[model samples]
Target: MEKNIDEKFIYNTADFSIELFKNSIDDKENSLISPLSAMLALAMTANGADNETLAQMEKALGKDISIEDLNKYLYTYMKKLPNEEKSKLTIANSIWFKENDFMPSKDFLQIIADYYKADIFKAAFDSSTVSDINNWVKSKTNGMIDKILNKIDPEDVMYLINAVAFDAEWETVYEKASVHEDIFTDVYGNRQKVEFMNSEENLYIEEENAVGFVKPYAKNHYSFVAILPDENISVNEYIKTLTGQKFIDLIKNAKITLVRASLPKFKYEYTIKMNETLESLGMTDAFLPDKADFSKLGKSDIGNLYISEVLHKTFISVDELGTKAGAVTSVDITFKTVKLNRPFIFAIIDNSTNLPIFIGTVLSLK
Candidate 1:
């Protein structure tokens, strides 16, 4: 029997998700990334890492939470996520290791199976393995994402993959009359014609340099969050100065107020091999050829095991319907307006615990 997740654990993970989002945001493009997906894959891999490598991974992910408790927290958290006909968030995990003399430890496999419930498979690491991996991703994400592997490198002895799909209709759908063509000034100051979903929402977030809103899904368990920094600050600059705790505080401190808001209808996918970015986050030794330690994960005839690459991909769409996160708040006030005719930040959060499932920044309509 699993217990509900700890509140502090949720905030720590959410803060880490915010850190990942800040690192992944693109100043020029419409960037959408899923921190939860990356975290899930890495959390599974961390079960195999040991010594300083594991310590670094833990520090990079969140400052205080240990991997042991993180597993229990996520196990309970995933069970509690909302999934129904009107709003759905689906998650899948898998582990693939080359079928070779490089045997994986029973302990490592068991922990992942117990905590992540990952589907484990042994592959020849051939072309068919690519098809099988891609097919798994396609089915898991409901075809929103088609592939997670283009080719398996020789150094790639193991692959840990996590896929998530979120589909939800807005609690209050945007009718044709509520959506209108609008001019969106991008980060570069270029204007493009974009369709905007206009609505009057309650719950306003106010920070020293930003203002935003939290919008709910079909049920109250999930929410779509967005923040617009002051013109004095660039989107990239603003992101650079973020942390997980700040995000939690920002959402918790939002005021309840009536406000007019506009969201653009947009869709895009993002992908990254998170080696350098992760190193900057203090997850350094896992990628070092000589320094990484995976003795606990077992050995191969070839060489010492270390993570070669961590791949992450995400997709999102915001239209007249609702939106989708690891990560938001409320206020009641006058009909003051905060129209989003420019680049801003957005995220999908679990309202119950204020953790982000996904966090991203939209720079342009196209």
Candidate 2:
């Protein structure tokens, strides 16, 4: 039995993933971003937008698709993604509005509930709200990320959030014998010794400037991809040259061949303020108080409702056992490794769409 997700929707999501990753890249530090989570949070907020605000968000999210259709596609896509023991992927969304200060439109609430399955909350926006929001995030992320907001602004009226948790084991777990100490050269050419999990993977991806392997997770519906750039170029340079289409092509064209792969055990957490990043991607009006028109979401008597910040935090741990990652994206409507060894890129992707659910770079792991 199978279901169909629109072909164009798949490519659009792929493009969005790469664009989000490229812009959020940390040149010298370990970086990770769940484009899926950001898209979910923004798409939920988009349900409240109208006019230019909606237009900009639509353009940034899916260049050619309308928000209505995007909602349908996402609902179907996320539903079809498998979740079970050994290989699990869970996504959750919520909307919190300031008590008595904001009035959310009936249709906006209905649409988000129907498609996003978002839980709605009315909060006092005080210290209690802060802990409530953080607690919600913590539970949704399986406790991998405990906090997402430090404080709620007096002007802020609404908050939209998305959380994703991925836990999976490799098809062939790395044994103690396969783990060995190795030297990993960082982006700056400094070498550090770390434990590497050695394996011979059959799904090899070879491109003009990179070589990698696809290592399947327990059930094979999800797999890990590692891309190592040619030694001559730095990870930053290689990332700069990448586009969504190129990334998709590399994975789609992966050949069935044996590859000697070694992935270093990496575990770290990353947090970023994505306000400028979203604006740079053409989502400008949503962050502009005067220009934004979120009339559909609800009305804020305190002031115009505009996204104030988008805080994203992620945690990932990969060892001989398996991989565990959690990501949370908080849309503050204040208004809103590859690998393996030395400096590379990595992704956890669904085998069917080959879309990256979580993508990151391990420049220098801690």
TM-score of 1: 0.90
lDDT of 1 by residue, 114-174 (tens): 9888898898888898899878888888888887666766666677788888888788889
Stretches of candidate 1 above 4 Å error? 1-3, 183-193, 324-341
Off by over 4 Å in 2: 1-3, 183-193, 333-341
How far off is residue 102 in model 2, in Å?
0.9
Residue-level lDDT of model 2, residues 135-240, one tens digit each, is 9999998999998877777777888999999999999999999999876665556676789899999999888778899999998999999999987777878888
Measured by lDDT, the strongest candidate is 2
At residue 149, give the lDDT of candidate 1: 63
Write down the worst ten-residue block by lDDT for model 2: 333-342
Residue 348 alpha-carbon offset, candidate 1, angstroms = 0.5
The alpha-carbon deviation from the true structure for residue 296 of candidate 1, after best TM-score superposition, in angstroms, is: 2.0
TM-score of every candidate: 0.90, 0.94
Model 2: number of backbone collisions: 13
User: All predictions: root-mean-square deviation over Cα?
Assistant: 6.8, 3.6
User: Least accurate stretch of 10 residues (summed lDDT) in model 1?
Assistant: 327-336
